[PDB]
Amino acid sequence: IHWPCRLTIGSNLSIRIAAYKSILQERVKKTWTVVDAKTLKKEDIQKETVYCLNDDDETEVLKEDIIQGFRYGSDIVPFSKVDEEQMKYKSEGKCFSVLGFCKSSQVQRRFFMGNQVLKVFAARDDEAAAVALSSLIHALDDLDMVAIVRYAYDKRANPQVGVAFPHIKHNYECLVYVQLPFMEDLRQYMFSSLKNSKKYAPTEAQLNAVDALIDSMSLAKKDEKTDTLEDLFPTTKIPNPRFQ
Amino acid sequence: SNIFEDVEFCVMSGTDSQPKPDLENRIAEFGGYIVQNPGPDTYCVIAGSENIRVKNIILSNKHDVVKPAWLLECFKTKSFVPWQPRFMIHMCPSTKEHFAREYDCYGDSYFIDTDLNQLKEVFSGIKNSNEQTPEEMASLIADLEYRYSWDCSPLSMFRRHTVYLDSYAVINDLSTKNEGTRLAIKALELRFHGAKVVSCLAEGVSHVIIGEDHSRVADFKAFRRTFKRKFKILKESWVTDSIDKCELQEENQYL
Amino acid sequence: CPGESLINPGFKSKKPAGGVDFD
Amino acid sequence: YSGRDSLIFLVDASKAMFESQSEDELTPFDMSIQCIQSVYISKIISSDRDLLAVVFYGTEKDKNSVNFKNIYVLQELDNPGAKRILELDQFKGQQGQKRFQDMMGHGSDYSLSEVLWVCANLFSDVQFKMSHKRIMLFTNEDNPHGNDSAKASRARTKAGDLRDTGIFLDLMHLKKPGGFDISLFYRDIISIAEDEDLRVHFEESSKLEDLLRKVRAKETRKRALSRLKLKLNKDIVISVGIYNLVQKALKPPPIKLYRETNEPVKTKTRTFNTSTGGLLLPSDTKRSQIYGSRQIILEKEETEELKRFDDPGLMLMGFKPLVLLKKHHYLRPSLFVYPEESLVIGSSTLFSALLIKCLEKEVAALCRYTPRRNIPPYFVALVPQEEELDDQKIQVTPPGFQLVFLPFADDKRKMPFTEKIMATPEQVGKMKAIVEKLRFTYRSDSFENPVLQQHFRNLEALALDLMEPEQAVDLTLPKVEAMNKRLGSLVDEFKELVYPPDYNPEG
DNA sequence: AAACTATGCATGCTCTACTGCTTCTGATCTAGTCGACT
DNA sequence: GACTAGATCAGAAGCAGTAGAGCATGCATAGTTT
């Protein structure tokens, strides 16, 4: 689905843009349906959820007498849904703002988060927007820098902080947006160093054997005439065996 | 001693000399259902402090908040006392419609009389506003004093008698202030007693007071000739006698 | 072991988030 | 590091701790109470399974198992909660100080040996495994026992015994009218005497600033998602562990409570026949799917068996140049692969050799990945990751492999065809100037999730019955004013050079 | 030519189940003391 | 002998993370009726 928005740099510069989803984990269009074994019909099977208290009678309670609550240490604090909505963090939905620009080195691939990659083009049937986006992409590539941006799908969607970097090809140019981690998501784990270990140090013969293995199991062929790398095992062109 | 009969109450009072457990136990022994959260069945929530929960309830116009004092009074009299804005912090739309009939927007009623304490409570809710200007407030006060035979007050006994003092060497000049000992304090007392003192001699002046300096009598007698209305020259005994007797004295004996 | 978090032993202290600070 | 961390807050109740040097200043006792409250809130938010205690010494009353004199254990080792925070809140102000004096008292003598004995007894009572034992001393008396030397010797002996037991001691020295001097008595009691911590301090310790800095982010101990086998071929196998250095943070799951008494309820789901009313377990029912105007019926077991391809683990396929890997082919957060010598001996050596040679030749190991049983395989790339340290030698990048998922043919979506329009050099130069004006340095921990922070603030306000929730400043919102000031007129020139006179971008 | 409705997509919240790692608790066991006997 | 008390092992519970399904909400897109 084409997603219209405006890339904003400050409060006076705005470029109309359209975003699409390029890479995502595909799922099955249809799901299994529960049926009755004998009659083989979905109309003879009914699923329903009920709530009851922890008492010998197990008396039932309607959904209108059920409240929300949270765990704060060793006790439970009630928090009704209406109060939660009253106190919920509110933001202006459908925002694509440029928080700033940073060198591409500072942003590493291992920190990428989310479950999708967005491709941002200029608005359809729009020449000025196309020129502005091309200028931004070319400037970013020439300076070797990316844009740290704030992205919100809509009012109900939680705000996100991500990185947009240029993508230039011989026929088309655009921006590629990928989510970035928050401070909470990062995990600080300590691992021992293998280089300075006196018990796991490889020997010369072992290194030579590993080098031979790596050379023999190469999955890319280097054509010298064109000085080009050809992929003998392209993974991106393999259909998912699950659906097959 | 079961005044209550199948009535649901929610209590969330915090800092109070009567903490929650005593009120909950009293309600339980009074035949009253107690709940920890409000709902469609509850008909009141009690809270003696302005915590976050009561604010959230206020922002949701679906319930009534009542101060703990209401339940204490209910316990005292052993009877169901009708509600009042005095015992309330917020009203749901239905209660707003109900109280809007026999209770004015403030905390006052037009069906039952009021006493000193009740009027003080009503005035407490009202907040100071500055939509008025000195002269118009004075005029409205004068009209109110005239309307209801309301001119008998002792401290408003000079409401309609503006007085100009001869404490300036040059008339209509604020830079010629004198150092009068008796005159200055006498003018201050006259102003404090309700009289209006104007530093500039305008057409609105009505009475003129001159001290022991008789040299200025001719100047005032000449000025009053041009004025459409002629003021009266009075001596200091007039004001002193009026204050001592608490009632206005005839200017004919003090002209 | 400088920088260790007093509140949570065994975890490196994290500096407060500074957002964006233009050069 | 296995177990729980236990902390004891020893707070002096001497007269000198209740005197304020200046009218507009916080007394040491109030500062200690505030620090304790902040630590309690931080522990509740981050590690709710830890143990905390609060003990006072120098008071008139006493409360302890051994029945010593002038030692009141206000709270024993227990998981933190709102009740303890509320209890401590009644000593924050001046009226709180009067209440504390009435309840316990102040101005009495004391012996540090008894205090340390009570702390050791409190530590011994806990039945859970305790990875860390810690005590903090909030005091402003560098010479607690100057008249008597036997008491000082007993305190020194008790401190040494506690240190041998494995109990850390910290001194959060507070402001003193004269000036704190650690060299007098506390050089020995304190577990570690820093070289810089020998001069006379005229101000409160710098650790109080760290304590008062609230941390509202959950802390998770190191754990391995899976311990799998890397198979170079059918007969060469090593053991590796997988970790998630980056993981999305989610709000704690809500709990369903009863309206009347806030008593938790239990939710049960069941399936019943419409025409019979009987209850059917999840084995009587079959599964269906309508393809080609026909119904296909498969059992649950067969449906589960549809996903069986290969045993869990990683299978080597080859080595690919890193250039062929693409940044925009991101599909899923990456994982970290590290050696695991427990299962197989010799894995570390081969792993190190592979990492070294992959770094040398700039190649990535293409592998087939199956995390759990009955899960379709995926294609992943292990990119070597060297060990990178910061200035202070603290490790910032561990050594190992970065597992990055590779999309299939179904994970890509076709794009609408769009004509390309190239900007002139002048426009690119103006945009370069704007970008340079709006340059800044980026760090992975320079942003916070506003939703989670606001949720934590609201939860704390509700639990502690605060007047109003604390508002969290959002650092992800663009600084419009600063950007406008910095850019200056460049925006107008760019708009004039790129947009026609009548464009109206907003419309 | 305009309004209503079928169809689909993107995202947040929730029940439900399943797999794996870590920690706690019930159950299976040797040293010290008193006592019985011969 | 018996008791009591120390120390060792193995199973269950808690928790984290993933996958599947459903619901609700919002929005966009295209076909049918008048």
Closest CA to D451 of D426, D474, D481: D474
DSSP state of A54: S
> Residue D252 corresponds to which tokens in the numbers above?
């704690």
Residue A82, token pair as written in the block: 């209406």
CA distances from A52 to B17, D21, D29, D265 (A): 37, 60, 49, 6
Residue A78 contacts B where some CB pair is shorter than 8 Å = yes
Contacts of A196 (CB under 8 A, 6+ apart): none
Q: Closest chain D residue to C21 measured between Cα atoms?
A: D440
The pairing of strands D286-290 and D295-298 is: antiparallel
Query: Given a contact as 3+ CB pairs under 8 Å, which chains touch A?
Result: B, C, D
d(CA D338, CA D314): 13
Residue B123 CA to residue A53 CA, distance in Å, equals 51
The answer to whether the CB of B37 falls within 8 A of the CB of B9 is no
Widest Cα–Cα separation across chain B = 89
Q: Contact at 8 Å (CB) between D43 and D218? A: no
User: DSSP of A183-200, one letter per residue?
Assistant: TTTB-------STT-SSS
d(CA D250, CA A121): 31
- Nearest CA to A10 out of D434, D418, B250, D229 is that of D434
Please indicate whether, in this complex, the C-beta atoms of A83 and B39 are within 8 angstroms of each other: no
DSSP string, D153-211: HHHHHHHHHHHHHT-EEEE-----SS-B-TTTTHHHHSS---SSTTSPB-S--THHHHH
For C21, the enclosing helix (H) or strand (E) is none
Three-state secondary-structure class, residue D148:
coil
* Residue A89 Cα distances to A68, A182, D139, angstroms: 18, 17, 41
Is A158 in contact with A169 (CB distance < 8 Å)?
A: no
For B115, the 3-state DSSP assignment is coil
Phi-psi region of A58 (alpha: psi -120 to 50; beta: other; left: phi over 0): left
Distance D124 CA to F5 C1' (A): 18
By the CB < 8 Å criterion, does D464 face chain A?
A: no
Instruction: Return all residues near A148 (Cβ < 8 A) that are at least 6 apart.
Output: A98, A99, A100, A101, A102, A107, A161, A162, A163, A180, C20, D440, D442
Nearest nucleotide to A114 (CA to C1') is E11
Judge C/B contact: 3 or more CB pairs < 8 A.
Answer: no
Asked if the C-beta of C4 comes within 8 angstroms of chain D's C-beta atoms, the answer is: no
Q: Exposure string (b/e) for C1-23, b if CB count within 10 Å is 16 or more?
A: eeeebbbbeebeebeeeebbeee
DSSP per-residue codes, A104-165: TTTS-GGG-EEEEEEEEEEPTT-HHHHHHHHHHHHHHHHHTEEEEEEEESSSSSPPEEEEEE
Chain-centre distance for alpha carbon B175: 37
Q: What are phi and psi of A137, to 5 degrees?
A: -65, -45
CB B169 within 8 A of CB B183: no
Give strand letter and number of the nucleotide nearest A160 (CA to C1').
E11
Determine if strand F comes within 7 Å of the CB of A115: no
Helix (H) or strand (E) holding D68: none
C-alpha dist (Å) from residue D168 to C8, D37, D141, D145, D373:
14, 21, 20, 22, 46
Residue with tokens 């940044």: D327
CA dist list (Å): B173 to B168, B226, B253: 7, 19, 31
Q: Nearest 5°: CA angle at B25, between B22 and B28?
A: 150
Q: Is B65 helix (H, G, I), strand (E, B) or coil?
A: strand
C15 in reach of chain A (CB within 8 A): no
Shortest CA gap C7–chain A (Å): 15
Q: How far apart are CA D451 and CA A88, in angstroms?
A: 8
Q: How far is the CA of D128 from the C1' of F3 (A)?
A: 28
Cβ contact C22–A188 (<8 Å): no
Q: What is the DSSP letter of B124?
A: H
Distance D246 CA to F17 C1' (A): 13
* PDB experimental method: cryo-EM
Query: A195 CA to chain B: closest CA distance, Å?
Result: 57
User: Which residues in chain A have Cβ-Cβ distances shorter than 8 Å to B60?
Assistant: 82-83, 86
Token pair belonging to D402: 């970065």
What one-character-per-residue DSSP string does D341-398 give? TTTSTTHHHHHHHHHHHHHHHTEEEEEEEE-STT---EEEEEEEE--EE-TTS-EEE-
Q: Are B54 and B65 a contacting pair, CB within 8 Å?
A: yes
Best of C20, C21, C23 to substitute, by most chain D Cβ atoms within 10 angstroms, is: C20
Q: Where are the alpha helices (H) located in B103-208, listed in sequence order?
A: 116-125, 134-147, 182-192
- CB-based contacts of A229: which residues, under 8 Å, 6+ apart? A220, A221, A222, A223, D321, D323, D324
H or E segment to which residue B58 belongs? helix B52-59
Tell me the C-alpha to C-alpha distance, in Å, between residue B103 and each of B24, B112, B121, D265. 31, 10, 14, 44
Strand F closer than 7 A to residue A31 Cβ: yes
Amino acid at D423: A
Report if CB A1 to strand F is under 7 Å: yes
Residues in chain A: 244
Strands B65-66 and B45-46: parallel
**What SS3 state is found at A16?**
strand
Q: D145-182: buried (b, 16+ CB within 10 Å) or exposed (e) per residue?
A: beeeeebbebbeebbeebbeeebbbbbbbbbbeeebbb
Give Cα D467 to chain centroid, integer Å: 28
Helices then strands, counting H and E runs in chain D, come out as 13, 18
d(CA A19, CA A94): 12
* Closest C-alpha to D167, from D112, D111, D120: D120
Judged by DSSP in three states, D146 sits in coil
Q: Could you tell me where the DSSP H helices lie in D403-504?
A: 425-437, 450-464, 480-487, 490-498
Phi-psi region for residue A96, left (φ > 0), alpha (ψ -120 to 50) or beta?
beta
Strand F bases with any atom < 7 A from protein Cβ = 16-22, 26-29
Position D162: which residue type? Answer: L
What CA–CA distance (Å, rounded) separates A70 from A78?
A: 6
Q: How far is the CA of D113 from the C1' of E34 (A)?
A: 38
Note whether A235 contacts D399, CB cutoff 8 Å: no
Nearest CA among A244, A46, A39 for reference residue D286:
A39
- Contacts of residues B231-237 at CB distance under 8 Å and 24 or more positions apart, as own/partner, are B231/B164, B231/B205, B231/B206, B231/B207, B232/B207, B232/B208, B233/B208, B234/B207, B234/B208, B234/B209, B235/B210, B236/B182, B236/B186, B236/B209, B236/B211
Q: Determine how β-strand A160-168 pairs with β-strand B8-11.
A: unpaired
CA distance D436 to A143: 9
Amino acid at B141: I
Identify the CA nearest to D28 among candidates D170, D181, D145, D139. D139
Binding residues for strand E (Cβ < 7 Å): A 1, 21, 29, 49, 68, 116, 153-154, 156-158; D 2-4, 127-129, 223-224, 226-227, 251, 253-254, 256, 267-269, 282, 312, 372-374
Q: At what angle do helices D94-103 and D28-46 cross, to 10 degrees?
A: 90
The answer to whether A189 CB sits below 7 Å from nucleic acid chain F is no
Contacts of C14 in chain A (CB under 8 A): 183, 188
- For an interface test with C, the pick among D213, D395, D449 (most C C-beta atoms closer than 10 Å) comes out as D213
Q: Which bases of strand E have any atom within 7 Å of the beta carbon of a protein residue?
A: 8-17, 19-25
Touch criterion met for D and B (3+ Cβ pairs within 8 Å): yes
> Rounded to an integer, what is the distance from CA B195 to the centroid of its chain?
21
Residue A2 beta carbon within 7 A of nucleic strand F: yes
Rounded distance, CA A99 to CA A146, Å?
A: 11
Angle between helix axes D347-361 and A204-216 (nearest 10 degrees) is 60
| Residues D479, C20: C-beta atoms closer than 8 Å | yes
D220 Cβ within 7 A of any nucleic strand F atom:
yes
Q: What is the secondary structure of B185-198 as a DSSP string?
A: HHHHHHHHTT-EE-
Are D176 and D140 in contact by the 8 Å Cβ rule? The answer is yes
Tell me the two tokens of residue D44.
Answer: 């509740």
Decide: B10 and B43 in contact? Cβ < 8 Å. Answer: no
- Judged by a CB distance cut-off of 8 A, whether residue B37 touches chain D is yes
- Give contacts of A9 with chain C, Cβ < 8 Å: none
From CA A57, how far away is CA B249, in angstroms rounded? 92
Could you give the 3-state DSSP secondary structure of residue D304? helix
Cβ under 8 Å to C: D residues 271-330: none
DSSP D106: -
Q: How far apart are CA A141 and CA A103, in angstroms?
A: 10
C3 touches A at CB < 8 Å: no
Give the separation between CA D436 and CA A101, rounded to whole angstroms. 8
Q: How far apart are CA D266 and CA D252, in angstroms?
A: 18
Cα distance between residue B107 and residue B177, in whole Å: 49
Residue B169, CA distances (Å) to A61, A92, B213, D177 in order: 91, 69, 11, 63
- Cβ atoms D438, A49 nearer than 8 A: no
Chain-centre distance for alpha carbon B215? 46
* Angstrom distance (rounded) from CA D248 to CA B122: 56
**Contact pairs from chain C to chain D, CB under 8 Å:** 63
Residue B253: burial class (beta carbons within 10 Å; 0-12, 13-18, 19+): exposed
CB A198 under 7 Å to nucleic chain F: no
Q: How would you classify residue B12: left for phi > 0, otherwise alpha for psi between -120 and 50, otherwise beta?
A: alpha
Q: Which two tokens stand for residue D500?
A: 């026609």
Q: Is C6 on the interface with A (CB under 8 A)?
A: no
**Residue whose C-alpha is closest to residue D64's, from D150, D129, D124, D4:** D124
Dihedral, CA of residue A212, residue D382, residue A240 and residue D297, to nearest 10: 110
Q: Are residues A232 and D379 in contact, defined by beta-carbon separation less than 8 angstroms?
A: no
